[PDB]
Design a protein around this ligand. Sequence first.
Ligand SMILES: CC[C@H](CO)Nc1nc(NCc2ccccc2)c2ncn(C(C)C)c2n1
Length: 309
Amino acid sequence: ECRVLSIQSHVVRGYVGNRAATFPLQVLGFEVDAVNSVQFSNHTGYSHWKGQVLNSDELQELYDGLKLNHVNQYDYVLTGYTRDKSFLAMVVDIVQELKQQNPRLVYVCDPVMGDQRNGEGAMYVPDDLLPVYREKVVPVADIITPNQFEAELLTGRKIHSQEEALEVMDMLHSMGPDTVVITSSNLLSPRGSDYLMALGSQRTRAPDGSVVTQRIRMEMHKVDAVFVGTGDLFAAMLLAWTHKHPNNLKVACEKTVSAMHHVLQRTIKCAKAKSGEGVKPSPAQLELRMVQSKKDIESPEIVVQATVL
Ligand SMILES: CC[C@H](CO)Nc1nc(NCc2ccccc2)c2ncn(C(C)C)c2n1
């Protein structure tokens, strides 16, 4: 389709934020407009890093710039990782106005707060953004893609099983999103810890008989290491697919997830090819071979399966 306004980080080297969401959304042909929330030499997982960040007024400035020219009409809107309470507030205001300009304006929001290894408490962002995502952000998004950990901070409920997972999504939907996709979880699955499971559900409509929800469950094949930027590349590719497949939360994750295995085992492939068998690949070597996946980002050779409910 077309016009995406993506507000995310930018790194000179590597793939994270806009660097991870642009090329994709581009070769799949979207007119991606990018607002760089920060500009760092590289992501903060490298030993060193240097750069500047955009404050709230600077973001404001760029947005004014677009109003004045009346070119501020967008179809879908994308956002991810932020550290600033205020930058996230502003971002909310901006997404509001853009929905009047275009009624079918879907705000796709990956609520990046932190991570899980196995049941817990603190995350990656200060704890003071938690409220903003819950009270202000999530009520306006139309597609969110949280961790199991994050889905729990949002709903404030701990996920212990599968159907406890499904009822944390429902408290999600009701929050606003006619789509929720738990990109990853601690939940063992019908296939072994070798794998990794994610969850998906989409609250739809038909006049009365006013209720439809759809659920599924992909299990893609875990990979031995620490990548950074995977969730940006995920949410980016979701949008694409969930673009073509408006009532098919099923059909979507399916191609997205599929593309994800290629990109990573090519990354992992080259990744080790730079220590072969012998030592751990450095942050540098793990960076996504997004370019080389020129060909797969493109054509998901559908390698995964999923069960409705
Ligand atoms: C904080 C987690 C990670 C550390 O391994 N580093 C990092 N660093 C990033 N660099 C940009 C940045 C630096 C400082 C503050 C805010 C953003 C970054 N951008 C998007 N993402 C993630 C959510 C995919 C980013 N992640």
